[PDB]
Design a protein around this nucleic acid. Structure first.
Length: 462
RNA sequence: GGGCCAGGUCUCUCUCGUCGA
RNA sequence: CGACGAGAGAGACC
């Protein structure tokens, strides 16, 4: 991905966007009870914790493109992957407008608590003003399609989130591209039946995790995996993706029957952006919050691993590759050990910057003891070894609890962390309930015991 | 609430129900 | 006990 040009949105006639200036995150009643080192991400240039120039930093993720042409490995990569997907018999029909707005089986209705994007943002208009779940009226939206059409600009916002010290100082905040209400709808009409099929079939056919519930699914994953595992992290995955990869994705969509819509993918590759007082074009790089970003990032992720294995390990039977991706995250198996250090080198020639898994120092062998997925570990239950605990380390749970976006919700917030935390096992869990209760607000909460959660978990296989 | 923020998945909580044994 | 509808509110993850 590469910024093609930038300039004052007034030079062009685009309005300014009101970006918020201060975080919703504040220290919580538990801020001093636990240990943490994360703070709210930098949101603006004036932020005193900056150790460099903000806009320089936030936009630095676009490293540039590596390749414009789809290689022969990619082409095969495509063929194989499209092959898998064909086995799902995926409905290729356009989705009806009423469903793309208000939802249907396998696809959730649009969120009316979020923005409608450009141009509606600027008129001060809102999603609730065009959609009505009660009537499920489509007539008004249709006119807005007729009016403003599609391929509208993405409105770019800073992600408001807990981030590590250096990343705070270094100003490396994450970005969010706000899809036009018009484009989400066109996308859903074009690909809704695609999205729903993925939502319905998380696993090793789709190669996607979207739609899994880690509490139940963790126990199914080892069963689907081949004998040996490999894995790695990506650097700035989204903003590295070279336009070649989009062309590959388009090929997959033709090959599985979505040939006419492969144009929509073009708007994701060559996008135009509003950001406060500025405006810019980007070539390459998946836009953070466009319709289908989870699905397409996973699909391209499926093509990358197939490609890299080919231009590295000749005579690899991609039929015995078993992977699951959530966007850039991935867990992958094969019958013989494979060398992430080796695939990492290949990746370089594709604009992909691939580091060792679990932020490790040097490349290492992945086992069921040290593999992570969606930030969880795998630990077999001590009494039912075919049941696998998704294990969120306490460390990340400690970080979360030390802040809040509204103390009014302190009970829900903490209750929700227990559901993650108890998989560390009774000892650490009761020590966690102890620390919560070591302050008065702690003791005002209704919290569940290990015995209760362990019971409910065991019962959900049933 | 603190001063106008995307696309999603899963989970939990409150209120109202449809079909269902 | 079993899907799912809407109205809310939140948490984690990508």
């Amino acid at each position: 991905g590469e910024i093609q040009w930038m300039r004052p949105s007034k030079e062009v006639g685009y309005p300014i966007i009101n970006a918020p200036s201060k975080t919703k995150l504040e220290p919580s009643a538990f801020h001093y009870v636990f240990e943490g080192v994360k703070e709210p991400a930098v949101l603006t240039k004036n932020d005193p914790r900056l150790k460099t120039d903000f806009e320089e930093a936030i936009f630095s993720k676009y490293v540039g493109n590596k390749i414009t042409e789809v290689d022969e490995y990619m082409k095969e990569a495509v063929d194989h992957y499209a092959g898998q997907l064909m086995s799902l018999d995926i409905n290729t029909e356009q989705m009806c407008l009423e469903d793309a707005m208000y939802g249907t089986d396998g696809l959730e209705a649009l969120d009316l608590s979020t923005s409608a994007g450009y141009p509606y943002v600027a008129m001060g208009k809102k999603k609730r003003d065009i959609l009505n779940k009660q009537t499920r009226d489509t007539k008004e939206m249709q006119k807005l399609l007729d009016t403003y059409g599609i391929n509208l600009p993405l409105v770019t916002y800073v992600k408001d989130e807990l981030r590590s010290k250096t990343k705070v100082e270094q100003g490396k905040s994450r970005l969010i591209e706000a899809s036009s209400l018009n484009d989400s709808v066109a996308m859903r009409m074009a690909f809704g039946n695609l999205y729903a099929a993925f939502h319905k079939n998380p696993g090793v056919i789709t190669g996607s995790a979207v739609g899994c519930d880690p509490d139940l699914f963790w126990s199914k994953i080892p069963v689907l995996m081949e004998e040996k595992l490999f894995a790695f992290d990506y650097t700035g995955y989204d903003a590295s993706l070279s336009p070649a990869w989009f062309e590959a994705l388009k090929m997959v969509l033709e090959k599985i029957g979505f040939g006419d819509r492969v144009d929509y993918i073009d708007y994701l590759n060559h996008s135009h952006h509003l950001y406060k007082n500025k405006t810019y074009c980007v070539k390459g790089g998946m836009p953070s919050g466009a319709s289908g970003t989870s699905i397409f990032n996973s699909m391209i992720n499926n093509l990358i691993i197939r490609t890299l294995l080919l231009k590295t390990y000749k005579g690899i039977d991609l039929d015995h590759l078993k992977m699951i991706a959530y966007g850039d995250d991935v867990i992958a198996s094969y019958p013989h050990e494979v060398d992430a250090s080796l695939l990492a080198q290949s990746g370089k020639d594709y604009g992909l910057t691939m580091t060792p898994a679990d932020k490790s120092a040097t490349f290492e062998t992945v086992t069921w003891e040290n593999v992570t997925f969606l930030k969880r570990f795998f630990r077999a239950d001590e009494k039912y070894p075919f049941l696998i605990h998704p294990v969120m380390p306490m460390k990340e749970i400690h970080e979360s609890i030390r802040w809040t976006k509204d103390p009014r919700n302190t009970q829900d917030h903490v209750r929700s962390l227990c559901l993650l935390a108890w998989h560390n096992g009774e000892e650490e869990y009761n020590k966690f309930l102890a620390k919560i209760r070591s302050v008065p607000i702690g003791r005002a909460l209704d919290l569940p015991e290990y015995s209760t959660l362990y019971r409910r978990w065991l019962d959900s296989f049933g």
